[PDB]
Amino acid sequence: PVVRASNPAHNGRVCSTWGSFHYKTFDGDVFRFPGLCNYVFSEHCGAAYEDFNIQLRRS
Amino acid sequence: SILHGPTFAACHAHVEPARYYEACVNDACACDSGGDCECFCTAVAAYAQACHEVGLCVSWRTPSICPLFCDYYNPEGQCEWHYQPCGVPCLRTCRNP
Amino acid sequence: NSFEDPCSLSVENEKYAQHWCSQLTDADGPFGRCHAAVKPGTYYSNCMFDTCNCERSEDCLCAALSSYVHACAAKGVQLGGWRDGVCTKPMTTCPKS
Helix, strand or coil: CCCCCCCCCCHHHCCEEECCCEEECCCCCEEECCCCCEEEEEECCCCCCCCCEEEEECC | CHHHCHHHCCHHHCCCCHHHHHHHHHHHHHCCCCCHHHHHHHHHHHHHHHHHHCCCCCCCCECCECCCCHHHHCCCCCCCCCCCCCCCCCCCCCCCC | CCCCCHHHHCHHHHHHHHHHHHHHCCCCCCCHHHCCCCCCHHHHHHHHHHHHHCCCHHHHHHHHHHHHHHHHHHCCCCCCCCCCCCCCHHHHCCCCC
16 A cells, blocks of 8 residues: 655644643644543544553643 | 454354453463464454354455465466355265265 | 443553452452352452442442352351451441441
8 A cells, every 4th residue: 555645744643732721633623621630632442452542631 | 352343343243252352362361382373363263153153254364364375275277266254065076966 | 232441441440440359359358258159250350340430439349349248148158347448438337326
């Protein structure tokens, strides 16, 4: 399977949280969620076996 | 996890994969003296045979998951041997003409 | 029915469930006198699943342990003193007299 790439803008592959509970999803949706509990940042739920499972907690 | 994914999705309603998955994991954990792929292939083939017995013939073997060297049986210049999940109960032979 | 493993979804829940539900299968623990009358494997699995799954982990753990204790009592085995450590809250909180 040959997959070509030319566009270097890869903001769709990046998700981040910063500042006062600011979240940016992989798809570009920026929102605020002031949750201080333990939450699933990102996990591989699309397969029978999970490759990664990242969780973050705030204080 | 192959015993829980889309590969055996159709069989999940006809054969419960719980004990087969447990045996798979236990055998793969205990197959530490050499030849763990044989242990895994046997564990998955047990569930595959259970699926095939009740009418569901799923194709689970891939060149990276328990490959079968059918081409080994082809005579020089011939191409006859094929992988069958269902099997061929009444292929024509000269013992059952 | 789905092939979920709640204990794999949380490290701390797994640690708590393994630490407190393994007393069922301990040969010398508070439940060791009953390993002959009642086999504790199913109760251990139920304890693990319930503790990892439900939000009130201690309540489900205590429910599983009490279920095993009741099953033992149905066989004529008494396991008094098993509430030392965890599952001691029901001992103290009940009517005044």
